[PDB]
């Protein structure tokens, strides 16, 4: 039986462990996790939310950008709708509020407390702006939840409100975040409305937003201050149309995502996207591939990022229907040896379950990971809501935020076992060891 | 422990995956799946229905021939009965209908609707031929289901019927399919009865059959236009008698099927079958074998097709009772290296569960696959009927048709991962990679 | 402990069986099941589709009236929604199809299979009328699934169609069912389009609709030949609005439906509706009640039918939350004694689980039964069909959300229940619904005797 | 077999339903539920927190009196423990906070988030008063969670605080709720500290406490504005000690609580307490009973309320160990006939599982119901909360140990039960608790009829 032993043994994440190396690290938080998503796109955490229609739309995209990562919006929708999602991601970081909740001076405390829990936002609005007329919108005062805790249901909103003269107002529609933070701190207030010279209520700035924006400090932003976001396209005819309309809406990178990335359809597409001037303005990521040969071919075809993995995913029907694939650790080992030498970063899409699995991916040479099942069912994932249902039905996992922080925590910890202080070090310094059948079960 | 490491490691389908290779394919349907069942028997799809008494009798045999494959009728029955099955398979493609459902002009609409759902065919008959007398059978008219939807239960069939003069009739018992299709199209009708010069109702041709015959266009046919079909025989004394009576009935190939194909009983039999002139008119397939040595021996013994697999089947009691066998991927790898060089095609009988498993078999060198559990319980498999019971009891799987189409779809897709555009390419171009324990469980 | 000995014992359907009596019935369908829903509404079968939002909307009320009973549209919905529902019902016996599936001469046989199987109706359409322009709409021909069975996907429609000169046509937008039946026979065709003096496509009449209206000969109809359907209101100031518009929508009866009908709220609602001309034109059914006294009270208020049952509803939660009710069989025995002496029909609402339960309800005095649980989850019941684990279910979003198991179509179910009931009448020696009411005799079971069934 | 035919049949809550009667009620909250716990104690809602060690201690008795009923502190504890509990209850309506969370000018914003979220109370505190020394305690300012939202962890408190000259202050340690309400309005602040003539921090009053006392307008109060709470004793020589100290602790009623109250032990206990001035100053509730005779016996002994139920308690094991009891509904029907003819209220203790059960109990004659099982495992019930398998439970160590399933907060539960009961009153045609008692009519169910609910 000769032919039956030429066949190499491929390894997946669960086949190996990170051998512990000497660590000079002397600080729980001194490891740096900055990486590169593609050739000209750095990320502060190396986590990418997957372009699966059960994972990443606007909410997911915004959340991960803010945690310092990024999501790639799926393509299983219209072109218009995909850019609809995209255009919303770019507005997400605005601390200005058009159309804030208004109220008239002669309504009662019962109505004030009605409008404070309007079905518009979760938790309600934090205040109401007291205006003279719902079409004029001249600022007369402000009313918070506090101002109503001691008044009768049928009491004049005009009496409880803080009057506009006693308010901190601003007439500068292009006001900084630094300056509005100053006005909030200087006036011991949490609401700075923005008024025209006339007196009109143009915008509202509230301290919730100012706090949430000073918080997410590792956030991955573009040049114009908006949140980074990627979009996924196919290889068909109408897919070049989709790719133009997506860079219009504001895509920062485009990901071409076919099942078999080592194809002519993909190579041709990458060459196309990097060729036309309407789309070469953003980095072009290609996948999925699993061989070293595939890697050279796609970098050659002009690609700025590779996505690694032909069939290892939570929904890799590929191996049951086609019987194709590569165990994902080998696929990363083989594909990063090529793409590293050509300065091309790689996403390790597929097959990740633990944070420890993420250290394994990075140490095998990956620059980022694409997360699948691990994010489906989180608040910001799509699907009605304890369980979430989009067809599909996954249990609720909570907010994406603290799930990715513990995830980065694990990698940070995994890096320390490799004695690495940076993502590049993690890639170069990690040495693996295989386990057997009985080896995983402990 | 020296002797305990000379022993080679054998691989089964679930041990390996198809590594993805560059695919120049630029069309979802451009891969060709034609193959060869034996030396002088081509098939359009490489799927063979197994000679198990729970899988392939006349219904199964006809279905798979029509999908462009073939079944091999089992031998666990009489000789007469086996050719009974066979003689029926060869009549299956006739678009002529002897003894069509007749009715007399003076019966009522209630009786007309009775005879339309006679317990003879599923869904009923599509029409009734109105004749003057049940022994004479002179054509007076035709009555469809439509003609009765507006008539009272006790109404004259003679009034509702379309009269024979207003019908499209033909007097040509040897009429083409092309010509009868023309008469149906030219007369906007779906029934063309065939009458003697006298006036008698000899045959009926109906559009259901004409449609179903223009549909199954990849159908595997013999020279005389009948559907291909194979038969299985043993190696005993009465088995040579069975083999003569089977080529009489119309067998296109004979399969000798012993548990241990690498025997003298089999070699002797193959030599016998290829020797006698009553049986050398059809190709002779031999099995089952699992070693390269076995392959040479049986081609030498005059065989035109090899069946690969000593004990990997869904009911391979072989390994528990005798402890013999070979992991089926190695068995195919080793046995096709020999039989390819001698232009002899191989069936990869045993152990297939997914379509992906089928790509694996083809890529390991097989020319066709023999399907077992995957077809038991389909409509056209034997056994009363939700579950089917023949003793045995399997759940109902539906119609064989759409199960084999998705199956060929998977192989077609599996081929694309190998970068193959034809069965030969799939065999030559596929390169495998092994998975470990943890490697299959993702 | 005497205070506890003067509490009477109420009985429910599982406490009794019908004592068999001498049956002079031979022909198992010389048994009449017609009855009255209210004073001025007769039904062919005594089944009613309960006004629950998991049971009766457009499609259930249609099915139920075609089978010979009636459905009561629920009110857990806006007024506009309840009247829209009622309006769909009131036009489902029309055999004139407005705007039927068109197609133009130069499209392909591929473009035609696409048009025929598109789910315009549940299943699809059976022909496409061939016009020259989707606006002018002059009729040139007709194409049916059969014209396509022998052409490549690339063949034009003009190629395979039957031209208009060889179809049967009419210009009488007011054509009688007879008349069109006639043209379909005489011309041996299944489609008669109705065209304008010009030649434009105005309407299409298909054989299938003609064959429906010729079948369901038991269908519950109003004077204009439309399906009977009721609608439900409550007892708030706005339910008067709701009623008014439901009548203008064409409701045939209103059912005032509160969980405690023996109340001034309920009475005053019934008196309102009777005293307004915009609603007094239709029968007023009031409930729910469960004493003789309540019956007498709502009949005095004006009610044209009573709905019986405080408590026994399947997904009724009255018993647990409030601890109030009356076992249903006792309830029906008490109220209908009152209601028969004044000519007011009763609906026995709640707790029915088998046709034998329906037998017991009618035997105990009732004219009609309301079925919620037994009908929910059918084809024609509301809620979307979704597959899980090789089994089908229905999901009904927004309620008074949950998943009931798919029961198939309601027509066969309703026809067994009527058969079951006809069978039970034969045990009572009853050739009519009224006979069932007067003749039935009950015997009580202990818990043991229930296990024996 | 005659000896077995003269045994009467007692009924329990599942044997009956309330027969609906004519309801003249329109406004679903023109239904009064106030009632009497004993001769000289009225409650707004007829619910009582049973004196079981898995149900009523400090936090349950507070919640129950704020909701408008009362809790009975259990005695499975030392005397000191029972009086400590009662004392915590008697001071939970005080809006003066003694020793509130301090902090000194030179600490960090990190040192302040630490102080605000520390679980002084369940949730934390809302401000930290800024004093210069943890001993002298002169007030300099106030810091709230909002003052911190825009400063690095390393910023001083003096930096972000509001200085005392810009706060609203008072020096009246006797300030009225009105007065402080007034300063909170007029100064648009949520905190009014009370300081000394010097400037030391004496007390702090927060808006939240002011908003509580302005809400719970139904709270059960004593003459000094404190929550009503009862406490339980037994019938041993030392229970006299226990009672004496429980009264000096401020108990509002005592509940003598043995499993067989129709006994000289029980009677003699009731007579004792009435004849000692150190305890006769509060109402004496005696139980448990279950016959008319026992009622008459304890009323004669002096009892100001009776507790009904020998047996039906959830974790009562009387029936199995002793084989004694009376079905609860029969028990209540028997005793309250006696008790109404003498002006003594009754508590129906034991066996309640739904609001409809509460409806049946009041309808059968009772003035108040005791709930053990239904309240155990709530937020305010005793026992520690621990998580297992994605579900929360409570563990109550040392008993009369086990794990009950977390039910949430008791206020919503108590408010449904009252709603449920109000609903049941509407079936009885009852606009008051007494009306419920006089008007309710029962009907019996067989086992079958119970399944139908």
Author numbering:
A (entry chain B), B (entry chain B): 3 to 387, 394 to 398, 431 to 482
C (entry chain A), D (entry chain A): 3 to 402, 431 to 483
What did the original publication write about this model?
Here, we demonstrate the determination of the crystal structures of T. brucei GMPR; a protein that, unlike the GMPRs of host animals, possesses a CBS domain. We further show that TbGMPR activity is regulated by purine nucleotide binding to an allosteric regulatory site formed at the cleft between the catalytic and CBS domains of the enzyme. Our kinetic and structural analyses clearly demonstrate that the CBS domain has a pivotal role in the allosteric regulation of the activity and structure of TbGMPR, facilitating the transitions among three conformations: a tetramer, and octamers with relaxed and twisted conformations. A combination of X-ray crystallography and size-exclusion chromatography small-angle X-ray scattering (SEC-SAXS) analysis clearly revealed that TbGMPR can exist as a tetramer or an octamer depending on the nucleotide species that is bound to the CBS domain.
To obtain direct evidence for the allosteric binding of purine nucleotides to the CBS domain of TbGMPR, we attempted crystallization, with or without purine nucleotides, of the inactive mutant TbGMPR C318A, in which the catalytic residue Cys3186 was replaced by an alanine. We obtained the crystal without ligand (C318A apo) and successfully determined the structure, at 2.80-Å resolution, of a GMPR harboring a CBS domain. A monomer of C318A apo comprised two domains: the catalytic domain (Ser2–Phe97 and Arg226–Gly484) and the CBS domain (Leu98–Ser225). The former displayed a typical TIM-barrel fold with accessory α-helices and antiparallel β-sheets, whereas the latter had a tandem repeat of α–β–β–α folds characteristic to all CBS domains known to date. The interactions between the adjacent subunits in the tetramer involved a large number of hydrogen bonds and hydrophobic interactions, whereas the formation of the octamer was stabilized by a hydrogen bond and 14 C–C contacts between the CBS domains of subunit A in tetramer 1 and subunit A′ in tetramer 2, and equivalent interactions between subunit B and B′, C and C′, and D and D′. However, no interaction was observed between the catalytic domains, indicating that the CBS domain is essential for the formation of the TbGMPR octamer. Thus, it appears that GMP induces the transformation of TbGMPR from a “relaxed” (C318A apo) to a “twisted” form (C318A/GMP). However, the relative orientation of these domains was obviously different between C318A/GMP and C318A apo: the CBS domain is rotated ~40° between these two structures, a change that may be induced by an interaction between the base moiety of GMP and Arg93. Two of the three conformations were the crystal structures of C318A apo and C318A/GMP that represent the relaxed and the twisted octamers, respectively; the third conformation was a tetramer structure generated by dividing the C318A/GMP octamer in half.
